[PDB]
């Protein structure tokens, strides 16, 4: 019921961007589940459902597809991290 109720909320207030931010960062999920005082077992069932909701939103909204701008914006904001992580990887091997 509660989880079912929560999903109907993430569709009202939360934007797809904000939902992904919540799903992608583990610091963010904790601040969410702990602040909500959720049980751990129910927490995973919920994290599973939002992933599901996040996936249904992406299919629906071409803006989040490869050619979609929200995707390329997400990809632009993530780029500085991927670059440095790949740079560090190479130094080791090389």
């Amino acid at each position: 019921i509660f989880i079912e109720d929560a999903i109907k909320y993430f569709k009202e207030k939360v934007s797809t961007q904000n939902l992904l931010l919540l799903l992608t960062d583990n610091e963010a999920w904790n601040g969410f589940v702990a602040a909500a005082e959720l049980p751990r077992n129910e927490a995973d069932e919920l994290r599973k459902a939002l992933d599901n909701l996040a996936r249904q939103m992406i299919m629906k909204d071409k803006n989040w597809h490869d050619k979609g701008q929200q995707y390329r914006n997400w990809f632009l904001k993530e780029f500085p991290r991927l670059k440095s992580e790949l740079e560090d990887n190479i130094r080791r091997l090389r």
Partner: antibody
Amino acid sequence: QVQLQQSGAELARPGASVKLSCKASGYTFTSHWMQWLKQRPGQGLEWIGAIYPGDGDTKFTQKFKDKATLTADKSSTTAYMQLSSLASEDSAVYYCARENLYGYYFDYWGQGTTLTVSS
Amino acid sequence: QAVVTQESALTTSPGETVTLTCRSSTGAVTSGNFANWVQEKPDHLFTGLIGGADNRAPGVPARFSGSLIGDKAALIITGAQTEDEAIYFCALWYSDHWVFGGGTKLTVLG
């Protein structure tokens, strides 16, 4: 085979309202945005709005927000467009077309409803 | 309020390559605008040709291709046939709505 079958009143009075309908068959109705367009006599296509029969979400050009109302029936798989406050500029042929979800092209089209707004 | 611009008219001959273009008033046409082309033939026969700038719809001949050149979106007909005499509409996506251009009337000589 995907088919789009349109229907609706072909004559309306000024200031009145009318509801046009688009019956979809041959695919998963909830999965694709249903487009609505118009072509006035002697002009090109104009896009009005779209609806996602999955959750009833809609999109509009500002111009048509308080004029066109988009709805969809999941069970009969028919999209509807209600037009309000009809005027002369609303006389046109109205088309419904599917936006292929991942193609993004408009692949299948209704045969169009001809609407005249006159007294 | 966004404005989409196409050539009003172009001529070509059988066999030749011809290019139609689409321009956006807000800036360069990008992948996020999902450049969409539809062909209008007599008795209001509309046919979806291209989606997302270069996705060619099933059933569309190979001689049609789509691309972002410029600045703009382009429709290329590599070896035009007399049966390609039509009006070509280009539509751009602006976040939450499509805007159509005025269309190009393509004449095939001969």
